[PDB]
Symmetry: none
Subunit: 297 residues, 2 copies
């Protein structure tokens, strides 16, 4: 099940402005982005604010800490730059920024690269230099997904951008997956064998259709760290509706639907896959007044 | 560093017959199984025996207290039942697992027991004692001679005989190939890796990550933060030899080799990893429990 064990808001703000979250490398701490462009560190159990940093001059949409705790990616709404890489060692400082990329992720195996998305286009950057190594766009193969989000596979040898599979080493498109929806561009399964593009599950080896899972329509997905559970939430303002769903990652069978009856902004699980944090707005309310709810998994 | 503090010896015996050890949940006592099937509780502060319970009609091989202090698993050598579950809140037998020679609790939520009978895993409900699942796929068996089935940290997966199972679907996901005759493997507490003898496998992709020669024929246990792994090599009598090794749990690099110069039967640490208890043969049998400061 998912048992709520705590809730908190942005401390001492009239309107609580949490927009996104990720568990920090430090146990007991959650990092939260806010609608005024700040990064907050909270004790997730006590709900007390620890620290605050200034990142953007507009709402943070999404963030991702590196596994080693040294780096953080943020993206914002209408700032220039739209995304940035922060050091979180001795001093919190901007290392590099990614001009017009509205979404960024780390590489997965070795976190030495950042992949950013601008519309239909992927940009790959070196963390050390900040240099743009690659621009991935093929006019013949584009799907023009409206919510495209480029991503590396588990071993960093492949990229999925706009439903197109790229060999990173050669910088060549090797396969275009056919289009079935307007918005969702897809992710790699952590098993390294399958790609999940909206409702379609494709075999990475043969490019054959393995399964159709209608409940995944218009969902963003995240796996737990052990790769046993997949969380999906349907896109809707707030990014998501009021529900998320879990699936068995090993067979795509549904486990549970959780409807919190309030718009969801983000969801994350800790490295030990014991806790879920969900940002929820206090349906389709005009007032921004979010809370972070912590669930025991 | 492991600095010896003191020894618990079996009260009123010329030779001590301890075979296994665990700290109690709240850690006021050490729980020590014996070669005649008794469970003895020793006060850690005073060193004195506070209780002795008749658990099995053969030597206790292994035991595991539940984290909440309410339950204890035991396993024994011969006869029947080979394993049992005991209530710690009057001491009594709750359930027995007649043919399972090894048992463990589930890890994330301790509502289940997993037992091993040869190549077969059995999962039981703690409350009812009912067998919920039997996991065995003859297509995939490795027939490890010292197979011990185990849950992963989230309880979503089981490793049995080197085969990875999805518990929810009760389906074998993957067979890890066989490179030794005995050791069937464990999950790393980090949730990312499987440790099967000398092979470290990626849990998600199943690719080989590392070879760790020093782990050959070892049983392992981690500190409670999962930063240190203890390993002791089975004997080709004492289950282990006279040394154990510690390893950095993140990179599998050795930290220390501890030569006890006495054969080891078991070891355990407390929740805060301040203490290590080791069952050591002083004799040759005279198996005492030596307590060490960790460190
Ligand atoms: C108005 C402006 N605001 C936004 O646009 C805000 C955008 C935005 N917020 C969170 C995410 C997001 O994808 N979160 C991931 C988890 C993660 N942290 O990666 C997620 C996966 C499964 C889930 F069930 C839930 Cl609920 C969330 C997203 C998001 C939404 C869509 C896309 Cl294409 C990409 C995204 F990152
Ligand atoms: C000899 C005739 C009969 N006797 C036995 O068979 C006796 C069997 C037996 N005793 C202790 C264990 C055991 O695995 N202990 C664990 C710690 C724990 N408590 O889980 C351990 C981990 C790392 C170590 F460095 C040490 Cl030293 C011990 C074991 C044991 C040994 C092998 C296997 Cl497959 C399973 C086991 F439980």
């Amino acid at each position: 099940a998912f048992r709520p064990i705590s809730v908190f808001r942005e401390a001492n703000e009239d309107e609580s402005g949490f927009t996104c979250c990720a568990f920090s490398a430090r146990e007991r701490f959650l990092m939260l982005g806010t609608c005024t462009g700040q990064l907050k560190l909270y004790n997730v159990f006590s709900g007390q604010e620890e620290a605050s940093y200034n990142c953007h001059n507009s709402a943070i949409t999404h963030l991702e800490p590196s596994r080693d705790g040294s780096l953080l990616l943020t993206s914002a709404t209408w700032s220039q730059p739209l995304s940035a890489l922060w050091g979180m060692k001795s001093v919190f400082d901007m290392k590099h920024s990614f001009t017009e990329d509205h979404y960024v992720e780390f590489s997965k195996h070795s976190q030495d690269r950042v992949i950013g998305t601008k519309g239909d286009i992927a940009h790959i950057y070196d963390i050390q230099t900040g240099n743009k190594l690659l621009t991935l766009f093929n006019p013949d193969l584009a799907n023009n997904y409206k919510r495209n989000c480029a991503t590396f596979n588990p071993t960093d040898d492949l990229v999925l951008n706009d439903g197109v599979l790229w060999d990173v080493r050669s910088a060549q498109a090797i396969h275009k997956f056919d289009k079935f929806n307007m918005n969702i561009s897809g992710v790699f399964h952590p098993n390294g064998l399958e790609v999940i593009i909206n409702t379609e599950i494709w075999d990475l080896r043969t490019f054959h259709l393995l399964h159709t899972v209608p409940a995944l329509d218009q969902c963003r997905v995240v796996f737990n760290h052990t790769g046993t559970v997949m969380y999906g939430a349907m896109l809707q303002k707030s990014p998501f509706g009021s529900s998320f769903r879990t699936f068995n990652a090993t067979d795509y069978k549904p486990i549970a639907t959780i409807d919190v009856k309030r718009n969801i902004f983000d969801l994350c699980t800790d490295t030990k896959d014991c806790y879920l944090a969900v940002i929820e707005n206090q349906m389709d309310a005009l007032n921004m007044d979010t809370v972070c709810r912590l669930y025991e998994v």
